[PDB]
Design a protein around this ligand. Sequence first.
Ligand SMILES: O[C@@H]1[C@@H](O)[C@H](O[C@@H]2CO[C@@H](O)[C@H](O)[C@H]2O)OC[C@H]1O
Ligand SMILES: O[C@@H]1[C@@H](O)[C@H](O)OC[C@H]1O
Lengths: 341, 348
Amino acid sequence: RIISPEIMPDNKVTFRVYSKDASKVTITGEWQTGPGGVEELVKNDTGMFSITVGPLKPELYAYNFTVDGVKALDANNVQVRRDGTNYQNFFIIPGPESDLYFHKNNVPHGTVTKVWYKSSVIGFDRRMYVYTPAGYEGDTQRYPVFYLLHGAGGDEDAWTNMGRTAQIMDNLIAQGKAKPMIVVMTNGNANQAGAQNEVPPVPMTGKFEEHLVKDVVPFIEKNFRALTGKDNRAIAGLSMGGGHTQTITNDNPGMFSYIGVFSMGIMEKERDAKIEALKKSGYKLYWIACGKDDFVYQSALTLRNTLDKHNFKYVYRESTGGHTWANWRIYLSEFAPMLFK
Amino acid sequence: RIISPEIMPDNKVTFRVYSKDASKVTITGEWQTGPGGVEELVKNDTGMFSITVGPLKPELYAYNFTVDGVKALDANNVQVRRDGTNYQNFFIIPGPESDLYFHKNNVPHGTVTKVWYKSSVIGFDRRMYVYTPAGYEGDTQRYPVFYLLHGAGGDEDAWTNMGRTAQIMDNLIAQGKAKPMIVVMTNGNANQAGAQNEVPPVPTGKFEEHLVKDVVPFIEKNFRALTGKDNRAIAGLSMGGGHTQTITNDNPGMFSYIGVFSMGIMAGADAEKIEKERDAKIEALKKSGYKLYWIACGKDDFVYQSALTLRNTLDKHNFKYVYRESTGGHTWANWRIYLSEFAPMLFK
Ligand SMILES: O[C@@H]1[C@@H](O)[C@H](O[C@@H]2CO[C@@H](O)[C@H](O)[C@H]2O)OC[C@H]1O
Ligand SMILES: O[C@@H]1[C@@H](O)[C@H](O)OC[C@H]1O
């Protein structure tokens, strides 16, 4: 039996790959410096390649191997994630910064529902994922709703798979840090019916955004025990989805009171008029989060300046790092506790 | 820029792996006969390894590569399944025998819900998957319920992932071949809270007792379920076919449609006393008003003789069943076939 990864008491991590045939086995992982920082495993006489890295800071880290030039996952690690077409293994180093990302056996767990709905706007049925809080079943309580949008290359599975949304929400809700809430994760690619690993291509500017308001929101409010109205609605998205969030809220002032723009910036006289209408809409939070090293940083500054021009109040969270799921998990973790308060 | 697998118009399939630095790439796949059936890809002078196999009969086939002694999936194939800890790619050769396994864009799709429930019997909360038929949302109709159980090594994700349950049910229901129904896929491992790829380990007869005392009431409370035996079906494969027998034998009159896939006689205590209890349970079930007892098994399965022993014992009791013998053995290919044939029989 081969243990890989093996997390040590000092948060070093050992990885192992067996092969007497292979010449070179490397590992690519999210703790590394960059492409030049790929690391080579050391082969012993027995055929075992191994490497120990770290100590690593608490976080979720994805990785894979490369065996004589071919990508290979870690067959001894059952934890596998998917980012579009890119599959990688992962592990989580325990500690304060990663604690919300674990699936804990002593925490009540919310349901994840993969549900299809008709779309009058797009013209074919589409799939979304809906998280409901623990204890939703068997009760009559109604809950506010948070619409959570992915970026380019993603799909309705991404926020749970890459973003650990079910764990983050289970843990925040159980800890009393976020209110119980329904989280709705749409597929933001209007040409798709659902995630490409399960749903084939179907045999469009503005259509996703229009469909969220005209098709998704009514379906959620009809088919789930949802509170209604702007103070019970939140919306956030990353990158492309942060653009969707702006378009949706700019075009529908007074529909969402909690608005989050993750790793995205600006995308006219119409623009200024829509800011003025949104400014007067009674919103409660406009939260902009971006990493200092993200290529979109300057565009996010332009967004902030454009809001400043209108004396439009927002909160800005600048973080370390760049355009990564590590940052998007952090942003979700910080934004969800702000909602519906 | 690399297509792999490339399914050709004649149902041959080409696989490709690129690396100038690799020495040997082989492929392991379900069209092969045994471990000595692994096949070597041929390397061209530009670093592309390739092989063309087939023609293959219509079916879903899983596969992976081995690169210089290390398992590797096909990075150009987004279709990946999981059997416990074993991940493999797959593809589906179109044709009559595989058509139900495709996700079709012109077919209404049922919801798959991953829901947690308290278990008084097991003592901690557990996860199951529930399929509801297309159009469940937004309507008031109630639906009969089919409990579908996996075997050893599986979990509540297996029947949808390995078994293509959502596609089979969507397609059968849309074609009018099976009635709209709720399909409940439990985790049959009483020591687990949920599937090992998502849920960590937790700090007998318990599964079977919990299905009746915890799962069924939760489904009937929280889903729009018709109830009573004529609205209730249960089937399972291997270990889950054993669970199916134990549950139905211990609760005669609770299920009208019973499916035993790739499983035979249950082990028991003296040999005679076991047979007396077994006889009594057969007789009570015989008189229970059930509608269908369906036994399906591959002729090459190790369990074949035990399933024959079961059939012979039922014959001795004049207990009416239907037997479906198939080609092949103890495989998800057969379990998909069995689901595809059993679901159209239910609730009619
Ligand atoms: O899930 C997607 C991420 O994978 C994507 O990340 C970008 C991918 O291309 C690289 O060149 C960029 O550096 C990297 O940020 O971001 C969008 C998200 O939807
Ligand atoms: O891998 C198979 C498993 O999925 C099933 O549960 O029992 C038989 C095994 O061969």
